[PDB]
């Protein structure tokens, strides 16, 4: 189990660590989070008390370095930092643990929620979506735009999700206009899976990451990306059986985890009704359809 220590907490802030979250009061004696499960990526996130504008945060993997959080009063945010001095980092952290100034990552032993939400997400791939190569962790916030949004403005601060457009020359074979538009299998399997993602684990990783950024940062472009990636599978008549089974589980846990009160904005009614009730895969998402109907029947 690893630690993300904090220099101090000089402004009042709601802190998130994966699906959990707690309030720190201005200048409270908080020195960070302990007992973080090794083996998964993680995200540590921020919403200032005084300005709920800009949720922001950092994706990281404790295997990839020693990371701490330091408030920057010039730029006005809690910044993630790496300490290359391993020994010095251990000496400081051990002082904090002996003074119990850390919140414990509160994992329940029955609970696989974080694992199920991040099964296919890997730091190396996050870092290609979020281009900032000098750091081993990735900053995201609510306002960041995606490459596709930048085509419909700063390239350095963008989310480079894979571009998906059903009315594009990539998606439609010359001479198969009707077939390719009404059945997206060509686009799903040959263009995206075989050609771009290489395998369904990379496709599912981007999908899961898109979803987590939509949920934690209210990042609109990520929400668009999550839904597009779902719609491309559900609108393909030919999907490997194992992909649909895994997708049903992915979505199930993502619907389970969504805050009930953010449903109206994070869930596209058209895409979900189409996917669950009209599409080629309408009968293939038994777990997802069952939770959607019992938890958000208004949307349908």
């Amino acid at each position: 189990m690893n630690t993300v220590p904090f220099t101090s907490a000089p402004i009042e802030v709601t802190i998130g660590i994966d699906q959990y979250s707690f309030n720190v009061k201005e200048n409270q004696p908080f020195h960070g989070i302990k007992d973080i499960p090794i083996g998964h990526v993680h995200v540590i996130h921020f919403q200032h008390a005084d300005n709920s504008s800009m949720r922001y945060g950092y994706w990281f993997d404790c295997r990839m370095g020693n990371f701490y959080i330091q408030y920057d009063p010039k730029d006005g945010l809690y910044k993630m930092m790496e300490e290359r001095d391993g020994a010095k980092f251990e000496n400081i952290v051990h002082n904090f643990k002996e003074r119990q100034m850390m919140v414990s990552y509160p994992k329940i032993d029955e609970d696989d929620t974080w694992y199920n939400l991040t099964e296919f997400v890997q730091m190396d791939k996050i870092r290609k979506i979020v281009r900032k190569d000098e750091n081993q962790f990735s900053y995201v916030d609510s306002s960041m735009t995606t490459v596709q949004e930048n085509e419909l403005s700063d390239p350095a601060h963008s989310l480079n999700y894979t571009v998906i457009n059903f009315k594009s020359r990539e998606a439609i074979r010359p001479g198969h206009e009707m077939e390719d538009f009404l059945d997206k299998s060509y686009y799903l399997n040959t263009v995206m899976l075989q050609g771009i993602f290489k395998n369904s684990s990379n496709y599912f990783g981007e999908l899961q990451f898109a979803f987590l950024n939509a949920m934690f940062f209210g990042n609109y472009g990520s929400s668009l990306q999550w839904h597009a990636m779902i719609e491309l599978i559900c609108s393909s008549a030919t999907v490997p059986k194992h992909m649909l089974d895994k997708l049903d589980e992915i979505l199930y846990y993502q619907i389970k985890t969504l805050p009930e009160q953010y449903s109206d904005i994070l869930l596209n009614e058209r895409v979900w009704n189409i996917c669950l009730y009209s599409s080629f895969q309408k009968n293939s998402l038994h777990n997802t359809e069952k939770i959607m109907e019992n938890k958000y029947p208004e949307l349908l």
Binding site: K167, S168, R169, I172, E177, M178, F181
Partner: protein, 237 residues
């Protein structure tokens, strides 16, 4: 975007544009089977593609063979339309290709947009006008060429005959739609109006009689009365 009564004069500016109407692409008769079930029998059809400024009609004839062994024909028909339209654009020299294609039904938007992804500069738009182009098969010469086709075929017409020599395209188009609207509301009466007189003939190379300006006024008035009449007979007014 869409096309309504605010930007009506845009039809007659000098940006090439075409209407596309697909309401006669797939035509059937419905009949009883020996077993007392119901079945369809398709008949020839056509795509109505029309430059409103010049009157050039590009009449693509849809021979029933094109449906043999196919399923979901109402849906295939929109895609076949879009494909024939794209094929047409690709056959015109660049300076003849449209800047805009306006479809009369919004269900054609996606099929045509997908087929024209190669032509990103051609705008595909809907319209809020209820245009009566379905009545195109009430023009005898166009009906005749469609029903006699034994194979796919494109026949070119000028739907305004020689009118543009005497009137503006704005006025020719408005005559055309009055004519079509009437033919669509009561084909018999409308056809009675156009052709009971011998003195007035349809030239071999035209679709409509050779009316003088004064006789067109009389015709136009009679068609307005027809439309108003049927509107009463319909709504009991």
């Amino acid at each position: 975007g869409a096309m309504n009564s605010s930007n009506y004069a845009e039809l007659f500016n000098n940006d090439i544009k075409l209407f596309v109407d697909d309401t006669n692409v797939y035509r059937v008769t419905v009949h009883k089977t020996f077993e007392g079930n119901v079945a369809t029998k398709a008949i020839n059809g056509c795509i109505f593609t029309l430059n409103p400024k010049t009157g050039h009609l590009f009449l693509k004839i849809i021979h029933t063979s094109v449906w043999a062994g196919q399923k979901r024909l109402s849906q295939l028909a929109k895609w076949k339309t879009a494909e024939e339209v794209s094929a047409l654009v690709r056959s015109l020299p660049k300076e003849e290709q449209p800047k805009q294609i306006i479809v009369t039904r919004k269900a054609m938007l996606d099929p045509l947009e997908v087929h024209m992804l190669d032509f990103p500069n051609i705008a595909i738009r809907p319209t809020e006008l209820r245009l009566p182009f379905s009545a195109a098969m009430s023009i005898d010469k166009l009906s005749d060429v469609v029903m006699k086709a034994t194979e796919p075929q494109m026949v070119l017409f000028n739907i305004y005959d020689d009118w543009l020599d005497r009137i503006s395209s704005y006025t020719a188009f408005s005559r055309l739609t009055l004519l079509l609207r009437a033919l669509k509301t009561n084909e018999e009466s409308a056809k009675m109006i156009l052709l009971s007189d011998p003195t007035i003939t349809i030239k071999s190379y035209h679709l409509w009689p050779s009316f003088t300006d004064e006789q067109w006024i009389t015709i136009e008035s009679q068609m307005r009365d027809l439309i108003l009449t049927e509107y009463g007979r319909k709504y009991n007014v």
